[PDB]
């Protein structure tokens, strides 16, 4: 039985334009464990992206955190792109600073 990832994209701290912060993409509740995750800035893959080591939950689904340091501005658009065997197409989730 295969489970599609849940995805949240959000900042570590409340966003303030011009202030350094961390952008996270949390992927969880998926199975099997192989997964591809990119953080994007204005449609371009951010290269300095790190991720936590792979873990799993009591319901046997995996989860991990991808994250990068960034400095939000008014106009920069950020997103997370996820691919997994359960997805026909890569799933894109946009960052909304209020969420």
């Amino acid at each position: 039985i295969q489970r599609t990832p849940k995805i949240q994209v959000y900042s570590r701290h409340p966003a303030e334009n011009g202030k350094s912060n961390f952008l996270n993409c949390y992927v969880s509740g998926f199975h099997p464990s192989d997964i591809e995750v990119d953080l994007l800035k204005n449609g371009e893959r951010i290269e300095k992206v790190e991720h936590s080591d792979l873990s799993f939950s009591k319901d046997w689904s995996f989860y991990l955190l991808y994250y990068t340091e960034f400095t939000p501005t008014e106009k920069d658009e950020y997103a997370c792109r996820v691919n997994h065997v359960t997805l026909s197409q890569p799933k894109i989730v946009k960052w909304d600073r209020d969420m």
């Binding site: 949240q8 996270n24 792979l54 046997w60």
Partner: protein, 277 residues
């Protein structure tokens, strides 16, 4: 107490690409403290918390060797399951196990765990009596029979009631951590205008640990207001967690809504509302 020591094990076959990926991760009180991963630069047991650096080289060597033995054993299991389920040699498959003990404040075992999954689905589990097995399907019935013959339940019970408990005691002493770690959430309400004289009230809880938490909105008091937006609890990335719950309310009525935050770190439940300006 109460405290727990648990191991989460993963073996993932990847035919055509080499031997299975094998991992063991240990948790004291839901905090990772040791990790083995066959895919690491050097496959060996590593401390994952500073207090574990105390353990000497013989510990690391012995646990690494067990991991290597376990790894070999799961390679065999992956093939066995292929036979049980009549699956092809070409597919990728996953075995997961959770093993460990939860002990009560009196230092006695509350529950022992030995639970297996195959491809993300329950396969077999040691019952609470620590004497009998629950097989999830006919394949697991084969395993159940083998283990009944080998007295596996009795071997595990000795591990869970004895060894596991004893190591937990040592690990707690290492960490100097007999009181559970907690960080209380800090909460606040944000205000977001919406079209046609409506308002989003979003109640945030930040910087809390562990992850377990409840947020509610109330009308006046005693309101279990149903249609909240809510996000799953999520890691902040610095070791703490975040969550929020929102309601949409009429402009000018924000002062009648109350957010409540329930968390084990708090001397008592937080109550808060939108603070105009």
């Amino acid at each position: 107490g109460p405290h727990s020591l648990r191991y989460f094990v993963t073996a993932v076959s990847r035919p055509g690409l080499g031997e299975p990926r094998y991992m063991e991760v240990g948790y004291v009180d839901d905090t990772e403290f040791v990790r083995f991963d066959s895919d690491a630069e050097n496959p060996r047991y590593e401390p994952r918390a500073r207090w574990m650096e105390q353990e000497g080289p013989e510990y690391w060597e012995r646990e690494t060797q067990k991991a290597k033995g376990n790894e070999q054993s799961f390679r065999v299991d992956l093939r066995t399951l292929l036979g049980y389920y009549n699956q092809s040699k070409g597919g990728s498959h996953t075995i997961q196990v959770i093993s460990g003990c939860e002990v009560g404040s009196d230092g006695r075992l509350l529950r022992g765990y030995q639970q297996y999954a195959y491809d993300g689905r329950d396969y077999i589990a040691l019952n609470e009596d620590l004497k009998t097995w629950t097989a999830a399907d006919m394949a697991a019935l084969i395993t159940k029979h083998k283990w009944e013959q080998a007295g596996e339940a009795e071997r595990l019970r000795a591990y869970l009631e004895g060894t596991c408990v004893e190591w937990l005691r040592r690990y707690l002493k290492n960490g100097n951590a007999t009181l559970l770690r907690t960080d209380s959430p800090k909460a606040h309400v944000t205000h977001h205008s919406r079209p046609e004289d409506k308002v989003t009230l979003r109640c945030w809880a930040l910087g809390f640990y562990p992850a377990d938490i409840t947020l509610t909105w109330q009308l006046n008091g005693e309101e279990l207001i149903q249609d909240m937006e809510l996000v799953e609890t999520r890691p902040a990335g610095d070791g703490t967690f975040q969550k929020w719950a929102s309601v949409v309310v009429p402009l000018g009525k924000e002062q009648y809504y109350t957010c409540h935050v329930y968390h084990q770190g708090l001397p008592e439940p937080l109550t808060l509302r939108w603070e105009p300006c």
